[model samples]
Target: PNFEVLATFRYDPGFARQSASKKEIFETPDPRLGLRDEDIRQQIINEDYSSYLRVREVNSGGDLLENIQHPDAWKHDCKTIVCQRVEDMLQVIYERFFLLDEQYQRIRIALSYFKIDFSTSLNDLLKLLVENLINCKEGNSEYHEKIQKMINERQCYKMRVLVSKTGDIRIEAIPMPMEPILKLTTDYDSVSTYFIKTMLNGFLIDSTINWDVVVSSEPLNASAFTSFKTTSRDHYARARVRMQTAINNLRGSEPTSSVSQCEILFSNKSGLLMEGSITNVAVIQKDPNGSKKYVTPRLATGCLCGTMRHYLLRLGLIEEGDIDIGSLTVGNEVLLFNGVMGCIKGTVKTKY
Candidate 1:
């Protein structure tokens, strides 16, 4: 295999040329205060009444004099800022989901994924989310009342917390709310837990999404580098956008109706299944004994190591394997999953 000409299409000018406008790279918040880092953080706190009244005291077991000044501004004098905000908005999104069981696990995992040096423990961060949510609800009673009404009626609202690389954070209580679809699923326990949590979170704070499909016009490298495979890597967004553009181009004028299906991506060089445009793809492998297992393409094949993929792998619900496009027969059952949609079953209707 000649590797020299492999990346030619990435800069092919017409389809995959890089965007002229600049996008920010993912960076962990600096421990040391810059000229404006602390300033920005303070500004965010001051403007948003939902913020902490003072820096939370570090949980150190001792009768030191500093203990008396709990929740005092002096605690943040150095502005080392225990909570390190990582770049990439999508990286820490799942942690915000109100899954009581996995909140700590998800928060700790996401924090460590970025290799952040946080002085505060996981409990601090968790409490911070609740404190802000409750405080903000009181500050905006009218708007919060509407959101409360939606929740009471079993509906959904969107709450997005944006954390800047400077350790500044802000919350947006989105006005638009969504209604849940009752006929989506029948058996709850039979479905993947990841799906249930994500679906419920979507109803609570996000919107349900459709897995649109598109046939890629050209062959491309389906897998990313190990580090880039994760959501923590903000730079990968550019590549994803580029691929989405290619999918839209391939869809031509039928793009609007193509929103129901996801684009199938394969390796240009190896002809192995990579993943869907917005998800990780898995196939149900059956044995002669009538037993079945969910098998997804290995990371070596270049698919995105999505959070749902990670969770399922950890739970032993899915195994990694290589999949060739030709081997996926029509009517074959496929499992598509991502952070947004969680785990859902699909079938191969026909070969495009």
Candidate 2:
């Protein structure tokens, strides 16, 4: 946008409408919701045309204020004053529409008052606006905390792995953060590969499986390896088949239960993703002495809804419910199904 300064007579009824809109949009919500009223007011005060009127009004015993309060002040011979007031109001509208901050408002107003005017070219105004916004508060710490919180909470891990496709097996813990994991699982092919790789040790071994097409086929007993797959649909048929094959091939082959659980990851474009392995899988039962509880994934702008999550619905592993992040406590058990192993269990430590 183009920023313009409109001139309104001190007595114009339009001033009230403009001011009310500004207050309603900016003042009602906190900064988290967007603009604040004080910022809007500051922007007006910073603009050159508006600043001039403000100074004039302040000097003249707040006559500008009185004119706004009056019913028919616009009918009076206050053409110069009205022009300045209108300019101020126009700047207010510009700021609100463009989602500009107070600093940008100040720079634009200052440039208009000092550098250019209605006669100035649009390109010149935009160049100045950009320069001012960039240089206004380059190193400001306004949203540092929010950024840090995101980094600290991301579910990242590094581990050794062998890729059968490439015939390469190496140890490297991949930092699969929440954002990337959410994106990777939203597609069908990606989900399929992710599940196959995580659950089957990249689908390498086959002797471990004890299945015969002619004989009784038993479920795979591979418990040493845990898999994590993020999928778009709540149900993944292809992934399930691959998982079964891997399990059947790996059963009784390994002495130890290397795979304890399968983790089917899901996300909505909103909400938080915590890291840990599932420790327990059980039905949620009510206790006479304990308070009632519900555990449902928090859905928000950035959450992933996993496929195994749907499998749980088919298997009756977890009933539909809702769980608030604020209510979760350490050591709380959650049911995991499909490829998901169970409720994530592990220590969560953080560094400053």
Candidate 3:
């Protein structure tokens, strides 16, 4: 057992195009996205943080909307097909409001959706998220199976949220996360990589087939990431899988911890409009416990921590971070893009 070795990431460039096209898809107007854009932004901007509480009141485990709020928010013209759509509407409404809840409750409802009946301790919840839902490979339900299958085949999902002028919140499923998207990347082992590694862990990035514009608090410098290119099997491809082992005899209570599928994006954060994909390079680090016996620190290790990301770092080979991603915009590797929307998340990097 003396063999020791380390391997680099294997990549599949989407097959090189037979020939370049005379047309450039990058030229286009920034999408206004119907009246929904202004409306959603207004809610995000004007509504007091507490208003989000209305969303939480409706979705926190009550099996009925008529059970809370102004029930009419969920009223509908019923039919078998539309009824389920209405249910979906109800569920989305619940989640939208659920998003308004504080951190503890946020984890509570998401776990409940998966029927996770476990300890509500922050320590336990993070562990459960990583081990049970985030890391677990044993998919048992239909949702798990279908999501698992899509990832095995390379697919993704998303649900967009909106608020009406009437204070009504609505959401719908779409094929793309946001219109006028862009793709970008940096050298594998550059300052960019270090910046991203320190700040963004488990964040999403992708190259755009098109581009767009955005307004920031105080802009610095952002230009088109032009060198982007693609083909099948590229590192910018999406990767998700469901582990097949059943986890039993866990902690807390019934609906115990354990998961069946793996994914980078989950729930509301998942994107739309693509045939299952991944972005750039994924980074691997040593598991502290495993590193105690460390040898090469294992790249692409199995879902031991329950997440493919266990002991690893991931940056979609090409995402909005990519150039010519005229469809969208973002900051540098420091304050990494939050994946979807034009919003930016806090960074571990220093600010000017």
Candidate 4:
């Protein structure tokens, strides 16, 4: 074990997209449909470019108020984890993450958490020694000498495992010199991803992601016009697989087998390729109650990504027109805007 460890862990703790408890599925008006409308509407946002932050400072980093949870804690690695009751931390993590994914996917960045552990390492002592020796040099030259002196003094020496772009892991110094790094790439589209081992949030200054969006002049069915919201096609497609599992279980209960699901997970993005087909996906009529086909797709309840709104709303078509909530059994039609896939439909083969 090192003196201090800041290991980052990124994953889902079993959060559901249309993941509201199944009980909400049978409600009269469907109780807010997972924090709909104003719950997730756009908010004014700003960026905090400072290289240092105060510890135990409570408040959003002057970014979007809604994006970061109100009762939040800022991590040294520059991550903001919304806090919860010690007893309810696990549940809150799940709840916030569902919305957090909405933001993370939309902003096209990996959502990550940092666990910083201190051990028996001697970094502070080392920094102190380095600074003392630099002070001993007789009249050091200002230009060349200043760079060496500040190495341990500025934000450049810190290490953090931060999520960069849609999916990247950066483990190294904060605010690595961008002038030196940018020289590595001659053009914007020249690289798919630039994985810099050492990074800080400020490195965002010269970074870009090849999220590789795709669209087709291909034809489509009329029902494809219906629209909904979600993280991305592949994500929702995976959600559908889970849906299949849930329905099979509910059907097992057979309370006269009266249950219908309006959940829909969009399909995978055409993979940044034009070898295209239907470009969007949404899932509706998942679990049939008996009469009405439920039409529900994941919405942007608490999209948590900060400083990026590219994935908010881009227009598109519907594969199967939305079904009536009153009819238990209906055709398969879903609508939602998946981050990577943009807008697509729910069909076999396109699933993750």
Candidate 5:
């Protein structure tokens, strides 16, 4: 997703206007409310377009960071995430806005862990940015108008926000395809199916989900992929720079593998299934009496806490457990889920 960058009132005095219109609202700060001047003051001091990187360079046919000689050599370690826009109230899913409360708390805790001092609370910053998108007049409104056009066309989009350790924040709105296409195939008669899969560290991508499905009959040998603990808070901060090297290495090592290859990951210490690089992994276990129950790996396993996992857990549709690859039976059904695609039905690869 590529988003139009925004310049708020914090940077441009001409943007300040006290009025409310059909689509814009500029409210005066209440005296009783403690406005965060320090937070507001942390403006984008330097404009650097080169540092921003997209996950995939669709036209170029590789990751966007591939062009950079040293991908992770950014000056500041920034925390970032890609969140989907809330389309309609009747849509019925988690996160009414850009992020859920729990997600915001996680980002806040992560910021503290990195010692990145941000005076503006995460919630307020989001509100301010959203307000700026609609209310800001002048040249900055071009960004808002572009997004408005996308919305009018019924196109889906996602917002990516980056907050640096130095306290500067950047927001971009990127248009997204309704779904992601992946390869999949199945034979209804196969009693037990098997797939060759590899394991790797979960890094280098944002968790904004798109429709993706991949299934195959061929098996590749299991390759050893490890976790990214080189930086203590890598998972929490979700800094793309720290993950660049690892993800690049993964791509380099498996040049022939499809992007949708079964790349699962396990906790380095616990040796339990954490999750797949893109989707949360789970297994449907059948009891001796033929009753079936779906089980997923616990978040403690060091997996990215995808929104789909949280929603399923809340609905009691799946139970959390310590799942190891060995515990899965040959013919057991495998379930993969993410925010956009929902739950996909697949079976473990069968052998002759």
Candidate 6:
């Protein structure tokens, strides 16, 4: 039987790349070097608007704030400046769908093995899915049945009622209140700055919707629900301590290991083990004698550096480079570091 799969993709604002043009505008030494006052004003407006759209696309949704005090003399320039901000917002949309596709593939494979029917409503099938996944990991039929019952009783009805409505309903689906993904620069001293600020602020405001409409309406039969929890100030402080300790441990271990191999290790309160690895340091290698040899950068970005980055640099197992997140692939043997159980082997666990 075929089954519909549900997956949700979210953007982490911290991962956003800085724009080259924005960097140039900010770094320019002469105030009047490039263009006329009007021209500069127009550029600013254009850039601001572009940035606004970018943030909206990437985060999947946001609000556009328009009420700003701009003098009539600069209003024309402000409008243009607001129109030109460039952001990788569309990439977020692409990723969301891509993730959904991956999830669907896994569900399809599972269904093929189990011979399940996909004609049922997605909500009902998901309960059985959760049960299957839980059972696979724990090998406990009782626990699986208990989970299935709980999901059936508690969640299925709510989802069915929500999705089955006759007309459109805009009920807030995300359990947590949305917060600003990017911190806006509140102090707007100059016109260009003000325009950039307003556009980003607007995008941040407008992009806080509960559901992404494009993904919802697609042929892909999937849905996702997510909830976020706010960390308390005390927990935040402790988290900082743990992170610092992990970094320190990684730094201490790098020197003794071979330049080709390295690992990081640390521990945390959670019983679940945490680890990351990087291998095939520096040069890419292919087997000369019919054996595969992999050599890639063992830098902080290529692999999870944790506490090990500082020490790895000192020990010379890895070096700093512009790491591409998308380039990392499965099957490459790399350094292994663990937070909970010290160092262990690492392998890529791809979904689907």
**What is the C-alpha local distance difference test score of candidate 4?**
0.25
- Show pairs that collide, candidate 1: 212-261, 212-262, 213-261, 213-262, 223-302
Candidate 4's C-alpha runs over 4 A off are 1-328, 347-352
**On lDDT, who's better, 3 or 6?**
6
lDDT per residue as tens, model 2, 154-188: 23332222222222222232343333543464232
lDDT tens digits by residue: candidate 1, 1-352 = 1111000000000111111232222122122211123433453444331221122233231222122212122122211111223211212222233221222233333334444443433334434443444454423546444333322232222444433333333443333322234324312211122123333221111234433443333345543332122233333343355445644555564333333454454444477777765567777788889866667877666565455565455445567777776677645767777544456555554344
Candidate 4: residue 196 lDDT (0-100) = 15
Q: What would you estimate as the lDDT of candidate 3? A: 0.21
Point out where model 5 deviates above 4 Å.
Answer: 1-99, 128-151, 179-257, 329-331, 340-342, 346-352
Tens-digit lDDT track of model 5 for 85-161: 33221111112232233234344445554556767654456554454344443346464454344233323334445
**Model 1 global lDDT (CA atoms, 0 to 1):** 0.39
- Model 6 lDDT vs. the true structure? 0.25
Whole-model Cα lDDT per candidate? 0.39, 0.27, 0.21, 0.25, 0.36, 0.25
Candidate 5 backbone overlaps, count: 10
Better of 4 and 5 by TM-score: 5
Q: Where is the poorest 10-residue window by lDDT in model 2? A: 7-16
What lDDT score is found at residue 219 in candidate 4? Answer: 19
Better of 1 and 4 by lDDT: 1
Task: Give the clash total for candidate 6.
Answer: 38
TM-score, predicted candidate 2 vs. hidden true structure = 0.20
Cα deviation of 278 in candidate 1 (Å)?
Answer: 2.5
Query: 178-281 in candidate 3: lDDT tens per residue?
Result: 12111132112222222222222223233221111111112211111101111222222212211111111111223334432111211111111111122222
- Model 5 vs. true fold: TM: 0.46
